[PDB]
């Protein structure tokens, strides 16, 4: 007869005053908090809400989570009563292949691609926006909202010899059509899995030119789209666009032209995910209830939580929602008060090693805090009634309210319009290369930092004469593609890839092999107004500079 309105299985008090679970003999006991014996064994203080079957709203009873009696695929950090357990999928495009719409074998270009979830914010402050921008809900996207939108970029490097302008390469003239094709893979980034129907992602080019809308058959697949796990298992064959169909991908000269002008496409994905997999106390089985589909129980999550975009695990924007609270909602008050600090602890995993809220090493002060038009005030008003100018201090005293949005990104590197790892400062850059493993007339072998290397477009190999000459090897913007990468974790550079497949030429072993680095933000992808295919107008960074006798 123990009091429990929620009916989830966690006696009100316990769920309000704090609780957790351990295993005596070999049984699981749900017991109240005990700062003593408990905080020692390493457990946690699971304080949830008594009036909600799942404080997060997601299809998983607070109990179901902590107890562990739930779909084993649910992300760990989501096994907690206050961490959203919803799926988030975006589309990755590994490589595309442009060809002249039907002896043709070399009349086709095939470049690789780099995809990465995005989170486009607002502009600077001049973009002419329609009057319907300062209305209620109208156009007020608050900078960023709910919707998955990935972004790919086409390898701007070379594929053949002296190729120039995809045009002449393929042979496309005004009255011609080019067919696009590519290999893409769905990949879940959230905290929950999808068991059947995948999303209906649409491929766009530019600001509205849709090139197609990919939505592979429903129920057709029984595979599982688990968290942090690419759909077509990385150990399988990546799905291929219109190539396995009766109407391919049409692209006219003008379009095919733009593609080259930016070498980038966009991928927007809906949210219609297959039904959900739930528990079943009776015989402890994992079933897919045709009666519960995210499309029903998902908006709630977004309407009663705090969203935080952090990028620590890598530079890829990771999303997570915490069980925040709303004042206007009685029920939503039954929720446990939330603090920005506590949040970053369960949401992603920040910890307090020696009393400093850091992340696997980095200090919470190494990341910039960016809020939306709303969240801004809601927090400003707190920093006010708390007398302070530094949030990193009163951090553990910031109340997170539902609908709150926060963007925690590493303060090291610079960021673009989509919030992507663009390129840091020369300082950090150089540092990452300070290490050397093997210098050769063939190519340098370094142990460059991953987090850094990801913001580098390429390297410019040159040679400075003992006087002051700037002779450069791969002098064409498209000759930056050199940096390789052994599976041992060491970046292997090669000068030979752009010098008649032959090693360096040292007429005088007293020169200076100057190998620079070019961050993405700086790198160029197309010739100048004229035909300057040179590395003249670039902002590279000195990464190497050894003498002729200081190599071999």
Instruction: Return binding residues for Ca(2+).
Output: 4, 6, 8, 10, 15, 49, 52, 62
| Smallest gap from residue 210 Cβ to its own copies (A) | 7
Among 1, 2, 3, 8, binds Ca ion (CB under 5 A): 8
Contact of 540 with 518, CB cutoff 8 Å: yes
Interactions with Ca ion, residue window 36-75 (CB under 5 A) = 52, 62
Q: Quick one: 356 or 381, whose CB is closer to its own copies?
A: 381
Grouping H, G, I as helix, E, B as strand and the rest as coil, residue 520 is coil
Cα dihedral 366, 372, 376, 377 in deg (nearest 10) = -170
Which residue number places its CB atom closest to Ca ion? Answer: 6
Q: Does 10 bind Ca ion (CB under 5 A)?
A: yes
Q: How far is CA 166 from the centre of its chain?
A: 30
Which range, of 6-14, 87-95, 159-167, 415-423, touches Ca ion by CB under 5 A? Answer: 6-14
The total of other beta-carbon atoms located within 10 Å of residue 500's CB is 7
Helix (H) or strand (E) holding 541: strand 541-542
Q: Quick one: 6 or 410, whose CB is closer to Ca ion?
A: 6
| Smallest gap from residue 4 Cβ to Ca ion (A) | 5
Burial of 502 (0-12, 13-18, 19+ CB in 10 A): exposed
| Smallest gap from residue 362 Cβ to its own copies (A) | 16
The total of other beta-carbon atoms located within 10 Å of residue 209's CB is 15
Q: Does 451 bind Ca ion (CB under 5 A)?
A: no
Extended strands (E) in 190-300 = 201-205, 209-214, 229-230, 239-240, 264-269, 275-278, 287-293
What is the spatial distance between Cα 366 and Cα 115, in angstroms, rounded to a whole number? 25
Interactions with Ca ion, residue window 478-537 (CB under 5 A) = none
Encode 284-294: b = buried (16+ Cβ within 10 Å), e = exposed.
eeeeeeeeebb
| Smallest gap from residue 47 Cβ to its own copies (A) | 9
| Smallest gap from residue 155 Cβ to its own copies (A) | 11
Q: Which does 242 bind (CB under 5 to 8 A by kind): its own copies, Ca ion, none?
A: none
Q: Does 15 bind Ca ion (CB under 5 A)?
A: yes
Per the listing, tokens 């997060």 go with 56
Q: Which does 250 bind (CB under 5 to 8 A by kind): Ca ion, its own copies, none?
A: none
Q: Which does 147 bind (CB under 5 to 8 A by kind): Ca ion, its own copies, none?
A: its own copies
Q: Two tokens at 341?
A: 């600090």
Q: Which does 393 bind (CB under 5 to 8 A by kind): Ca ion, its own copies, none?
A: none
| Smallest gap from residue 453 Cβ to its own copies (A) | 7
Residues that bind Ca ion (CB under 5 A): 6, 8, 10, 15, 52, 62
């Amino acid at each position: 007869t123990v009091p429990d309105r929620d009916n989830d299985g966690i006696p009100d008090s316990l769920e309000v005053e704090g609780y957790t679970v351990d295993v005596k003999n070999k049984r699981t006991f749900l017991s109240p908090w005990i700062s003593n014996i408990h905080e020692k064994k390493g457990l946690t203080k699971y304080k949830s809400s008594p009036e909600k079957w799942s404080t997060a709203s997601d299809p998983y009873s607070d109990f179901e989570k902590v107890t562990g009696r739930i779909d084993k695929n649910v992300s760990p950090e989501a096994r907690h009563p206050l961490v959203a357990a919803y799926p988030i999928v975006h589309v990755d495009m590994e490589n595309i292949i442009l060809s002249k719409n039907e002896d043709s074998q070399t009349r086709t270009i095939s470049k690789n691609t780099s995809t990465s979830r995005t989170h486009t914010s607002e502009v600077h402050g001049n973009a002419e926006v329609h009057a319907s921008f300062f209305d209620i809900g109208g156009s007020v996207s608050a900078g960023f909202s709910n919707s998955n939108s990935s972004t790919v970029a086409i390898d701007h490097s070379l594929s053949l010899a002296g190729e120039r302008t995809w045009a002449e390469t393929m042979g496309l003239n005004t009255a011609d059509t080019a067919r696009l094709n590519a290999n893409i893979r769905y990949v879940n980034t959230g905290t929950a899995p999808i068991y059947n129907v995948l999303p209906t992602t649409s491929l766009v080019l530019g600001k509205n030119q849709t090139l197609a809308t990919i939505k592979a058959k429903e129920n057709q697949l029984s595979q599982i789209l688990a968290p942090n796990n690419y759909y077509p298992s990385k150990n399988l064959a990546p799905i291929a666009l219109n190539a396995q169909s009766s109407t391919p991908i049409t692209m006219n000269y003008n379009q095919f032209l733009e593609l080259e002008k930016t070498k980038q496409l966009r991928l927007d994905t809906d949210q219609v995910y297959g039904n959900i997999a739930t528990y079943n106390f009776e015989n402890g089985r994992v079933r897919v209830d045709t009666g519960s589909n995210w499309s029903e129980v998902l908006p709630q999550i977004q309407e009663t939580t705090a969203r935080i975009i952090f990028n620590g695990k890598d530079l890829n924007l990771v999303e997570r929602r915490i069980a925040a609270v709303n004042p206007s909602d009685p029920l939503e008050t039954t929720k446990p008060d939330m603090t920005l600090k506590e949040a970053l602890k369960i949401a992603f995993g920040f910890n307090e090693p020696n009393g400093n809220l850091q992340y696997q090493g980095k200090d919470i002060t190494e990341f910039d805090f960016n809020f939306d038009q709303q969240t801004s005030q809601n927090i400003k008003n707190q920093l006010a009634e708390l007398n302070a100018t530094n949030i990193y201090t009163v951090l553990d005293k910031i109340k997170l309210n539902a609908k709150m949005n926060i963007l925690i990104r590493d303060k090291r590197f610079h960021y673009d319009r989509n919030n992507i790892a663009v390129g840091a400062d020369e300082s950090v850059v150089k540092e990452a290369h300070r290490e050397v493993i093997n210098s050769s007339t063939e190519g340098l072998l370094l142990n460059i930092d991953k987090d850094i290397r990801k913001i580098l477009s390429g390297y410019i190999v040159e040679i400075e004469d003992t006087e002051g000459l700037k002779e450069v090897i791969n002098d064409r913007y498209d000759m930056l593609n050199i940096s390789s990468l052994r599976q041992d974790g060491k970046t292997f550079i090669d000068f030979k890839k752009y010098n008649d497949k032959l090693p360096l030429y040292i007429s005088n072993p007293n020169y200076k092999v100057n190998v620079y680095a070019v961050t993405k933000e700086n790198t160029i992808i197309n010739p100048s107004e004229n035909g300057d295919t040179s590395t003249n107008g670039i902002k590279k960074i000195l990464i190497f500079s050894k003498k002729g006798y200081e190599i071999g």
